[PDB]
Amino acid sequence: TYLEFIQQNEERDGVRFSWNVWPSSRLEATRMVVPVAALFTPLKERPDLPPIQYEPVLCSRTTCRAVLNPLCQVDYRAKLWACNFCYQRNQFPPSYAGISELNQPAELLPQFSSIEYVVLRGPQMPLIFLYVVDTCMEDEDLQALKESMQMSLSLLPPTALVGLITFGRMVQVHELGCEGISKSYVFRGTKDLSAKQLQEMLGPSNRFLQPVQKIDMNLTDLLGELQRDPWPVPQGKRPLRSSGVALSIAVGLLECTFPNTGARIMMFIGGPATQGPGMVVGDELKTPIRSWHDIDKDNAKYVKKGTKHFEALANRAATTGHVIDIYACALDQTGLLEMKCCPNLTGGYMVMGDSFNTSLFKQTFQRVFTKDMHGQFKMGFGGTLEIKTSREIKISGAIGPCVSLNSKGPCVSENEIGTGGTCQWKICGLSPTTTLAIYFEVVGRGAIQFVTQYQHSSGQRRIRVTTIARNWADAQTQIQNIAASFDQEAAAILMARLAIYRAETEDVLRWLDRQLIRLCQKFGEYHKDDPSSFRFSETFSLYPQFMFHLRRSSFLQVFNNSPDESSYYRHHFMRQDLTQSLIMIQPILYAYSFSGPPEPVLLDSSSILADRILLMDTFFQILIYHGETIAQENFRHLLQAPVDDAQEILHSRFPMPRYIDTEHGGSQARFLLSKVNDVSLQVFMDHLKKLAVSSA
Amino acid sequence: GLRVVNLLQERNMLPSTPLKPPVPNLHEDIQKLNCNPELFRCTLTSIPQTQALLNKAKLPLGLLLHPFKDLVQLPVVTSSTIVRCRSCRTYINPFVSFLDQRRWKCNLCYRVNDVPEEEPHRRPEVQNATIEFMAPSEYMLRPPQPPVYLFVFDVSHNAVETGYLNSVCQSLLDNLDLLPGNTRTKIGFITFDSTIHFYGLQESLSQPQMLIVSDIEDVFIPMPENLLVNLNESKELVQDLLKTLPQMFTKTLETQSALGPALQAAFKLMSPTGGRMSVFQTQLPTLGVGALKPREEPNHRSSAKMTPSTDFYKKLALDCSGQQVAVDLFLLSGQYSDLASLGCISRYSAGSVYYYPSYHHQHNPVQVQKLQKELQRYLTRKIGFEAVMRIRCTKGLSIHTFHGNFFVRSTDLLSLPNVNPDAGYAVQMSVEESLTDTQLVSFQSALLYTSSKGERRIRVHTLCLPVVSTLNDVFLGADVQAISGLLANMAVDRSMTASLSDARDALVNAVIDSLSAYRSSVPGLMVPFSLRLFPLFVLALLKQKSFQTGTNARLDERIFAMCQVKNQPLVYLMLTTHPSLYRVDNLSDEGALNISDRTIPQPPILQLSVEKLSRDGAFLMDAGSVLMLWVGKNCTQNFLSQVLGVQNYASIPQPMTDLPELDTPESARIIAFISWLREQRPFFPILYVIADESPMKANFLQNMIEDRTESALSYYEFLLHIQQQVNK
Amino acid sequence: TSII
């Protein structure tokens, strides 16, 4: 079963391809209406594979240097193994001299096709957590932020290093535990500083970065005594907030102290940048913050210059290997559009709420420090992803939280998609859910090898090696099996990230149908000029419905949203696996009534019954709608069956979705009526068939 | 006292009793009202009638004033209006001329004024030459500023090694309630090394905040509040910082000091309000603006070849003056620090410098207790803020040169960001128009200041002097000590302006030309009675630290000696230049036993010569700021056991700070005489008995200005050179 | 300036 094939391979290898049977010819290596790509999750969790304490046993062929994998032909009596990417024959290292078929190495069993190695070289490096706190907020918000940061301090490992940077009009770099005076270095929020400058002005451990076990008591008291920015805010003005300078100082600090080691810059802001480089909005309240409508008519003189400042900090932190998180909670916009590249280039988080004093932020913030079965954080640092492909496979590029290392080789394609031109990428921050998208190009069973070297939260260096293989299409029957190996869910998300990438870097809503119509004409069934005869196989049947919700989603219709919300939505889509990505594009809807147990229903106005309860799960919102008749012991169980089921998913999802309890004639019933229903799906499908049976 | 004295025949000219200032030749009722000569005196009590007569006398005409001196009693007038002249705005004084019983003639511009509707001759403004007014609203540029004290500390590695910060913070803790002011008093603190450290003080926080400004080339204020805090409201918060400060920089490796930028930050902190800035520096500034090059110090061999090295601290001082900010400099350096440039911060802001050479908490107990006593006076004496002073004289006389720590605005308005009671000033005058019409001239100084209680007050001193037309009457009224003080101030300016040679030559020629002019208007060296101490006091000027030549003196020593000449009152300039030498091992009952139970001995003053000493006894030297008790190698056993508390000469302690109070009448006599000496002045002078043959305290010897040396003439050799040039 |  191709379904069993797709499901079992994502479970084991953390990968899902648009096509599972690949082009066998250069004649039609161009034929792909949807490119050969993969949704790769490098740190995909799975019930307990053995941590392999070897050295990964590399292929001695210079450029190749692939990892020993189950696709390699072995010879246990000649003590040789043949690499599957270049056919050069290797000799087993001394420690493998006593291997046999009765007891073979783990990296050769096909069950261990995705395997993790532990490389203990020398002294581990401690983790680094740098808090960057805004003090221009209300006391309710600032107090709750202080309490949240104090809690996270009690979860950090005893050896981890901690620093504190507070900023208002000025920027303070705090020197912890210094006698009984508690000093700090104050900088103007009106000018930027390089790493070299900051090193000279400030003078393994530091005065500014000290272990938790030796500092937690002093840092807890300091965090609890933080007060708002002492500078008054005149009437009709915003506070002078120097977000861009405080971040460039946090980046510059770690850059000259602990470069090339896992560190997490956690910036907490309660408003937009109003001063200095990176400024987002003016300081007078009468001028509102930029909107999407203000952006296109060119009434936003701060976007281009503000984005350029944070794009430079993003590339600075990503080159050094450090992570930038953005926790923004305010009632107005905050500047995510200008600062998006910092948690996008690095693997940093981006949390967005109305106030730090809500259950929404507090619970979301402590899920950052969720530990596994051994008491260690579910986060990795300094991840280097290298991809080894067969001679006939070339890498066009990657779309996701990563940065190119500008490494060249025979596996690099000439036409680059997203961040291409390399067979190696750096992911400063990654979690078990981090999912990249790699687009390939052909120029059986060719094999693609994923090698991810990262720093574990324990400090150990680790290498995850995933080797996959997909059958070369049989030259006698290709286009029939190629259509059979199509993954409509994976391809839709892979095509979706292509659309968002060029929209976020620009019409995009003219490239989408061209591939949908061409896909209809190639893998569909129809008589010419007969739209009623058009139809799709079960392999492609869900694809147009997937692309219908995509072109109308908030990911591409940026209006009716603020620029910060559009950047926030696009942020989480570029990082999620397939399962959660489908939820974003097409929210799942469950119905609750007396007539039967809970059951999924269609996302159409026809599912809205007066005597029924609906649970719409957008990834960003859990919404419970009460029908008009329902609105007005087991109708309690009808009014809590969604609450119970919503409660379980309202805990697993890292960015805790917003919870809505609305009704017919409710204020927030708008959220249900928008994503439900160029007009409707029926009209969309009929217009599609009239063009697929039409000119080619 | 009309006699003529032969200096070559006397050689014992110095009297045994203290020198009293001359009494001007005025009518008995005019002199009875004259100002106290310690507040205001003149070089020539008989004013020359013409500039030609003044030029013939070859003596300098000028005034020396101590206007803010602490007084026993002060008349404070509260009248609804201040009565001033309608032209030169001269305050009505005891030396005016009433004619129509409601019309008075101004004694400075001769204009008749309406006596305002407020017997007017009984009015206290006409019966007291020194008086203080309550300034009305028109004498205020702004509401009275509060008392603001900002303390700036050097915390480099060299400064930490001196240990000065331990005693300074202790003196502040001891005298925190004694700082002048009311509830409006504000206090602040700044420390620095290569970076500037501000200290915020709030009760809402458990500990003070040390805010580091590291941009040396662009200083700023890191916090809008809580850096200059209210003293009595934040008393406990100020006390905790003063206890913690000497403990923060123990392990400091910072060796460079950025004094300039630190002063720039301190000026910005006080720019809104103004006040007193207390700067404590221990080494040469080497980082940032105001950096000063090192210099190789002179020795006894170097020729006479002092000026500031930069104008930074001079420009910065003028900016402080424009904001009513005064800067007091405490230099506790052990090496060259270019005080010739650093002193500019206090000269042009009406501050004063305090020099403690080679201060160390463990190695120099003399400087340790000297700093303790001087800080006691510095933190407890009265103070006036945002002050100006004007000096008026009778028409025909003109002030042409000002001496002291201030900034001379145009129209000869002396700006004084702070006025302190230990400051002295000098002025040089000339007869611009002949005083033919007048017989009396007057001089009036007015000090407008804001008290530490927030009251605008005006302190006025008025002096009246007669006019003479004969060269003999000019010489008969000469004040030798005042002439010595004015020549010292003129010689200091000559040094910067020209060279130390010209300064030394102008001092010698002042004795030559005056006595040669005297001689040409009458064998040996004949001088009038009023000038018998003139060559002696000038020789004393040429031998002390300011102008001496073949000494091993260091640069910062000479600059500080010149700073004291420009800033001290005349009494302490004379006490320093010509100390008083008494023999104290044989005190008896010829003294001022007048003051109750105490009997205070009054031994005769001895001329400064080793020939006057004796290995059989002990000699105390009053140097003004210090009392050195020399003990001869063969001092009698009575003085050792009954005064020193020691059995033999060998057992006197290496540095002996003070005598013990023992239960002997000999001890009671000497403690009386020393107590009586110290009660005459504000900075308590430390008495050291360590002058001994082997204590390397040959400072005492340096003061015997009459003996010769391998680099200077003796007093006799000086008189012989004077006579040779007089009869040339 | 000043009227002192």
Add this chain to the structure above:
Amino acid sequence: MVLLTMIARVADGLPLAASMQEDDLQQYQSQAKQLFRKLNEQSPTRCTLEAGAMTFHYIIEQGVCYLVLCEAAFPKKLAFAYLEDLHSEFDEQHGKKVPTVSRPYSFIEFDTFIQKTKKLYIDSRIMVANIEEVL
């Protein structure tokens, strides 16, 4: 939006208490004294004057005038609310001896209460004239 506060006796314009901090001040402190000289028994007890970009506000209660100057954008309702509690505290334990003092600024120590109250109006966290008539 910045400030200037003066308390004076209406009869002779005698200053009682004030408060100023810079970081001009001269031209606006003079115009303040011009007003204290012109005010008398027939002046309005509550008025607002506007000098150029800045704006004067004052009240008169029991022969004592409470003047404040601020940037014209400062809310007028807050300017008068600031003058009343000043009058409330000043008149409570200084109003008995106001018509007896003779020295200027005989209540400089009211500086402390002024600046404390002053902090609580400049941080957001009746007649109209143009100050040219009376002068």
